[PDB]
Amino acid sequence: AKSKNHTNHNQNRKAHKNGIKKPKKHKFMSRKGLDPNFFRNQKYCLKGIQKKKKELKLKAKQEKNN
Amino acid sequence: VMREIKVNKLVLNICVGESGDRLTRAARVLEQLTEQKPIFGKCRKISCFVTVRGKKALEILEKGLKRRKNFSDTGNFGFGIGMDFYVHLSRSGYRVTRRTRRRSKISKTHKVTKEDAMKWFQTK
Amino acid sequence: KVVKNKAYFKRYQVKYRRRREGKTDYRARKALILQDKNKYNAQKLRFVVRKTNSQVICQIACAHIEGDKILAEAKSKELIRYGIPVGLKNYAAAYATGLLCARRFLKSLNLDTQFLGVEKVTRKPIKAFLDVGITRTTTGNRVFAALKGACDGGLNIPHGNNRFPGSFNPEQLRKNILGIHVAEYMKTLQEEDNDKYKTHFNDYLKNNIGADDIEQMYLNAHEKIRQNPKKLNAKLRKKRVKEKLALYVEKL
Amino acid sequence: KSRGKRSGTRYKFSKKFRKHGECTANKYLEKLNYGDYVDIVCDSTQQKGMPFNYYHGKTGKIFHITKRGVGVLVNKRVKHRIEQKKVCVRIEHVRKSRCNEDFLLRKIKNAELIKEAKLKNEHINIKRKTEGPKPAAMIKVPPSKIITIEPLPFY
RNA sequence: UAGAGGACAGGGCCUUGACCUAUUCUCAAACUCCCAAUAGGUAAAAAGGGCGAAAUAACUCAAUUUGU
RNA sequence: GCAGAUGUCCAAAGACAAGCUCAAAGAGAACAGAAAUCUCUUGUAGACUAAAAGGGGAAAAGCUUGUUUGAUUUCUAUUU
RNA sequence: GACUCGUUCAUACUACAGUGGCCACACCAGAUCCCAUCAGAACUCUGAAGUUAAGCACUGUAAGGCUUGGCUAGUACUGAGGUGGGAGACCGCUCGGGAACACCAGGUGAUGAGUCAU
């Protein structure tokens, strides 16, 4: 038989029953498809920083542990 | 002053309204009148015409001299012989309406209009 | 009918002021000044070449929101103190103006010693993009003359070679840069009809430079350029219209 | 039955009266940085990089910048939850948002106020005031303009 | 929907009109110069901001010291 | 529910660049007329843009010309 | 007085007038050369005899347009309340928001960087 085609009735209170949830808004976002030749260079920057920090820490550890 | 009316352009037109042979002959006679090449009309090819300037235009107008109504309100005129003569004459400084860089319009004081066109024709 | 109707004026939308005046293209302009948004603080310098019917102007411009900033400028009338007193609209004059603009820009930036350019005429250098400005880019154009001048001055201005005189003819380019094409015109006019020669190159003779001095004067000009670069308000309007009506009542 | 990309955008995506034509050359000179707020206003003269109908007039942060485009994070309401959407548009359709300009001006002004307040060790209230009830005012008025009002008759 | 004024066509200086100009009565869900109310979006600081120095990069720039 | 449209078409009607400006009206020119071609003036688009309708477009996105095949291979972040 | 590159994109536009020019723009003189066409008209190239006639600048008009303010008008419309009125169509009241056309008046620009001339 003929059926009710459509209605948005009660949909808003259904939505608000568990509230309108907001996005989590994390601090960091994946850089997978973003600005190549920039984030690759950023990887190089981080590697250089880590290498310098690690070599300095290793020097300190060796000179303090004899 | 540099307000004298010179002949800016003289156009000879031959409107046959059909295909070649006669069109080629019309182009040839236009060549003989003016060694410069003619162009043909629409190809919806029906007519041939040419544009001349300077001393050649003046002497061809003199040859065609052989009515004080067929002057246009924009200061141009023409007649017929078969061939149509039409001369568009203007004062100096018409470049400003034709060049690309600072294209603008001349004032109606600088325009030629029909009274000065007729007076120029009578004087010449 | 009238096409200047009140509704026509109501609905009319005006072009930009510069487009109305015919000065700028506003499509070439934004294609020239648009820089990749990744590149922050990328200047994108523009080598503007304009040619009046008396002398040519070359400048270096950087686009800014409040208006362009001009970092260097050179006019062909500056060639008087460099020894070119006549023919300041020439291909050679445009080359010299471009050379002067490039050299003076580099001097302002303190980079002359690091970017010597070229000698005589046959780290990465500064980059600038040529702005033509409404002129049609035919082969053998003074805009490309000035571009070659700046290139020899030491600026890196990208360019092809089809638009130099001859579609490549380095010898023809050299002679046009040195003004030989004007010397040949002087020679042929003098040899054919001296009267037209002296009525055409009138100021050349008054300057006492001949067809054989043009090349040398341009060479030494290049080298010395290189080595040293009222209103009426409503009250008056009402008074004037009142008095005009009073006068008109009797006069007409 | 008809749900194309630009369905229902007859007026939204039309240029204003006497405001037709491409964007100004100065629009290409505006500076965009990562994480700053931006308004998505569709410019119908530029067809590529055109945002979807929904995002016209929305605001979001930059998460990606390309040579002529920008990626902006926009919250869109989908029934029972808000969800983030990464819309990629050309720089003609994006504009530096002023949603936080008052915040930045307040930041700089409050900074230079707090500096001198701490210098003079004066305790100052820095938060915005949401001004409400006005104090009593002992106002003078000559009786030449205290005019009496009566409701008007019908005509 | 009506007249009012004014230099192409028709007949007998005249008329019929057309046309133009300034008006005039009345309208639009698939008309708009203008444009609400309501409704909607973003922002209102600490895992952050501001201000500097030093490091890193294969990125960017004319710049191994421009910028990011 | 209303007015329609689709199962196509295009080596150019795709790409780039350059130059140009369109519809229409008025005036003028042997044949030549309400219309055939040419000239001038005005011309915010009243044209054109494959098709339905709606947006967009004037040194263009329209017209003409030149050179072309980016109507190519691969992969992301994504919008409806 | 000026020019180049811009910004705003009509207070900047349009029509008709008046005034202005030394380097300044420009009109202008030519076509050997690069280049270009039917046409050196345009484009391009080479010039400097002439001219502010025009472009350009400034101003004017009970100018059109544009723009700002007032006024239309707390009108039209509208959010919330009503066991409000009215047979209904519609119309008040309470707590709030608030136009438009038209008409009237003023105005017709301002400005960034650089440069030339005196």
Side-chain angles (χ1 to χ4, degrees):
Chain A
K2 266 245 199 159
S3 67
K4 153 150 281 277
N5 298 96
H6 161 77
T7 193
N8 204 49
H9 197 260
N10 188 82
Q11 289 328 281
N12 229 9
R13 35 171 72 199
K14 263 170 67 180
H16 282 89
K17 203 89 72 78
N18 282 313
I20 316 288
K21 300 192 146 330
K22 271 154 136 193
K24 273 313 145 152
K25 192 168 302 335
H26 315 116
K27 168 144 192 170
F28 299 96
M29 155 170 310
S30 161
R31 58 174 79 152
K32 179 190 189 182
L34 301 193
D35 215 316
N37 321 315
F38 171 82
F39 280 121
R40 214 207 325 285
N41 184 69
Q42 289 293 290
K43 181 193 35 168
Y44 299 143
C45 301
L46 188 44
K47 287 172 153 329
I49 295 177
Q50 263 154 0
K51 145 174 186 302
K52 194 153 187 172
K53 214 178 70 38
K54 167 270 191 174
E55 62 88 22
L56 164 154
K57 200 147 64 62
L58 183 57
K59 192 58 65 183
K61 193 90 164 181
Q62 282 291 341
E63 68 94 31
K64 84 178 82 162
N65 200 66
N66 303 320
Chain B
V1 292
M2 72 168 338
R3 253 186 79 92
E4 51 285 27
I5 314 169
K6 280 176 268 146
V7 160
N8 174 287
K9 177 179 32 184
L10 184 268
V11 182
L12 301 323
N13 182 4
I14 314 271
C15 196
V16 196
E18 50 109 347
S19 179
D21 167 44
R22 184 31 201 161
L23 209 35
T24 326
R25 274 200 92 214
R28 214 201 300 91
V29 53
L30 269 194
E31 281 275 299
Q32 312 310 131
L33 207 30
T34 46
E35 67 269 15
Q36 69 180 83
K37 284 287 158 312
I39 329 304
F40 314 81
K42 97 184 294 184
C43 55
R44 49 94 188 156
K45 143 215 73 182
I46 75 147
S47 99
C48 79
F49 68 101
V50 84
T51 302
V52 313
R53 264 106 182 190
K55 314 192 161 123
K56 191 101 178 261
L58 271 193
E59 72 203 9
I60 273 158
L61 195 60
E62 271 285 0
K63 205 270 200 183
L65 147 76
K66 325 303 181 58
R67 160 33 31 179
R68 297 125 174 75
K69 201 274 307 184
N70 35 39
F71 290 74
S72 76
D73 38 353
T74 37
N76 317 306
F77 69 97
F79 46 88
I81 292 332
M83 149 172 29
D84 272 27
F85 280 58
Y86 204 95
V87 24
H88 153 45
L89 43 76
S90 63
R91 279 176 242 280
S92 190
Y94 195 70
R95 164 110 193 292
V96 317
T97 72
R98 294 311 211 221
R99 87 273 187 97
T100 319
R101 258 200 57 228
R102 317 273 317 269
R103 183 180 294 177
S104 55
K105 344 175 84 172
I106 65 178
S107 33
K108 77 162 319 173
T109 37
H110 202 77
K111 293 189 181 179
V112 281
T113 187
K114 206 159 89 129
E115 293 337 319
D116 320 64
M118 289 158 141
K119 289 174 37 60
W120 175 94
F121 167 65
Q122 289 175 359
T123 300
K124 175 213 81 63
Chain C
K1 214 82 191 173
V2 292
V3 281
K4 279 334 181 68
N5 224 337
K6 179 200 292 316
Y8 165 89
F9 284 127
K10 206 167 293 250
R11 288 185 85 69
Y12 194 85
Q13 168 177 354
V14 300
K15 302 315 217 325
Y16 295 148
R17 197 201 275 290
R18 299 306 290 286
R19 173 61 188 98
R20 250 151 46 223
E21 280 149 26
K23 309 263 202 47
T24 87
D25 191 281
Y26 272 130
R27 270 219 163 182
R29 160 161 187 81
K30 46 201 206 180
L32 274 153
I33 70 165
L34 181 44
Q35 173 73 269
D36 307 7
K37 313 298 261 192
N38 320 330
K39 299 173 183 188
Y40 319 105
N41 317 140
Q43 260 288 280
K44 184 157 281 220
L45 282 192
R46 182 177 29 120
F47 181 56
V48 174
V49 168
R50 296 296 179 271
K51 43 218 196 176
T52 79
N53 54 25
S54 96
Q55 101 277 45
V56 328
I57 323 163
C58 302
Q59 34 188 177
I60 295 293
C62 74
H64 280 239
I65 283 291
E66 59 274 26
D68 286 349
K69 318 275 236 197
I70 312 289
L71 317 180
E73 197 224 41
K75 291 196 175 66
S76 325
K77 258 198 178 307
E78 286 193 78
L79 305 183
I80 309 294
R81 45 159 300 211
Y82 295 107
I84 312 169
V86 79
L88 307 177
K89 212 177 42 67
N90 249 344
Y91 202 88
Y95 176 93
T97 319
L99 179 56
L100 177 54
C101 194
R103 287 325 294 192
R104 154 186 310 161
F105 184 43
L106 293 186
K107 188 204 188 177
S108 61
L109 289 198
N110 307 326
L111 309 169
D112 312 312
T113 83
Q114 323 204 20
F115 296 120
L116 281 202
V118 313
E119 311 315 312
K120 334 312 171 283
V121 181
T122 65
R123 66 185 269 188
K124 286 200 279 294
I126 315 270
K127 209 180 192 179
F129 306 120
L130 174 70
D131 194 342
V132 276
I134 314 281
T135 173
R136 186 175 320 186
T137 37
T138 67
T139 114
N141 199 337
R142 299 168 264 150
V143 286
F144 306 112
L147 167 138
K148 194 50 181 173
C151 216
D152 292 342
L155 262 47
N156 165 226
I157 307 186
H159 65 263
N161 292 351
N162 332 114
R163 290 318 156 173
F164 295 127
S167 315
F168 186 39
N169 204 329
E171 180 51 47
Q172 174 108 61
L173 185 46
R174 212 207 90 264
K175 69 165 42 62
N176 264 17
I177 280 169
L178 291 186
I180 301 311
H181 71 290
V182 186
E184 320 274 22
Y185 190 22
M186 275 177 86
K187 289 201 246 288
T188 178
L189 226 55
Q190 149 184 339
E191 165 275 357
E192 189 262 291
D193 46 343
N194 227 55
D195 46 3
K196 217 216 155 164
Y197 162 74
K198 44 173 89 57
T199 206
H200 200 270
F201 303 91
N202 196 25
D203 299 58
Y204 279 67
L205 322 166
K206 303 206 202 166
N207 283 21
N208 305 60
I209 78 98
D212 320 62
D213 314 50
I214 296 181
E215 198 198 5
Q216 199 32 66
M217 94 150 172
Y218 277 122
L219 257 328
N220 58 50
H222 292 165
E223 73 93 19
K224 76 165 46 59
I225 272 176
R226 267 171 179 289
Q227 57 95 359
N228 183 24
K230 204 60 61 162
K231 302 305 293 182
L232 184 147
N233 66 14
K235 269 304 296 312
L236 321 176
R237 207 157 268 129
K238 185 44 181 303
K239 195 74 52 203
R240 187 165 142 212
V241 69
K242 190 165 118 187
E243 91 209 349
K244 186 257 191 59
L245 261 183
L247 259 68
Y248 204 94
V249 161
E250 317 302 331
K251 96 106 173 192
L252 268 184
Chain D
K1 215 218 279 190
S2 209
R3 267 117 60 79
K5 293 325 186 340
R6 299 180 46 159
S7 53
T9 68
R10 171 184 183 151
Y11 299 106
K12 189 197 299 280
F13 283 2
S14 71
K15 302 230 71 65
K16 286 270 308 201
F17 188 56
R18 318 221 314 287
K19 299 300 215 311
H20 290 252
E22 316 268 41
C23 71
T24 53
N26 249 18
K27 179 133 190 55
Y28 289 162
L29 288 198
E30 85 176 328
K31 292 146 187 323
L32 300 174
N33 314 268
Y34 275 72
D36 71 27
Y37 300 104
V38 87
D39 285 344
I40 298 158
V41 180
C42 170
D43 173 350
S44 305
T45 44
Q46 180 61 270
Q47 278 86 53
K48 28 221 199 192
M50 249 180 98
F52 177 67
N53 158 41
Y54 176 89
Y55 309 99
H56 176 87
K58 306 302 212 218
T59 311
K61 314 180 54 100
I62 312 292
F63 80 91
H64 190 204
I65 291 174
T66 72
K67 72 199 287 274
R68 310 255 175 288
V70 82
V72 22
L73 289 167
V74 194
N75 310 327
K76 178 205 203 169
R77 154 99 181 254
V78 188
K79 308 192 212 245
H80 64 287
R81 90 288 192 170
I82 300 311
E83 80 168 289
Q84 261 187 2
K85 286 197 162 287
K86 317 191 178 176
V87 310
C88 319
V89 291
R90 286 195 43 119
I91 43 68
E92 293 97 320
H93 308 114
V94 109
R95 156 230 292 175
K96 198 49 164 8
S97 175
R98 314 169 55 207
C99 50
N100 63 341
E101 71 155 359
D102 73 298
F103 184 41
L104 319 171
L105 301 183
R106 202 194 320 134
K107 265 153 92 153
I108 64 104
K109 180 180 293 341
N110 290 1
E112 52 76 21
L113 251 51
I114 293 161
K115 174 202 51 53
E116 61 76 13
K118 261 168 145 23
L119 193 134
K120 320 206 318 300
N121 65 49
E122 315 291 330
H123 153 220
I124 172 167
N125 174 67
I126 211 50
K127 54 160 69 163
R128 266 164 316 158
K129 201 61 66 140
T130 171
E131 203 265 334
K134 27 199 51 179
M138 190 29 213
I139 82 160
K140 282 322 113 154
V141 69
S144 299
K145 47 270 200 193
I146 303 144
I147 78 97
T148 147
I149 281 300
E150 281 185 9
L152 312 163
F154 179 74
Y155 300 119

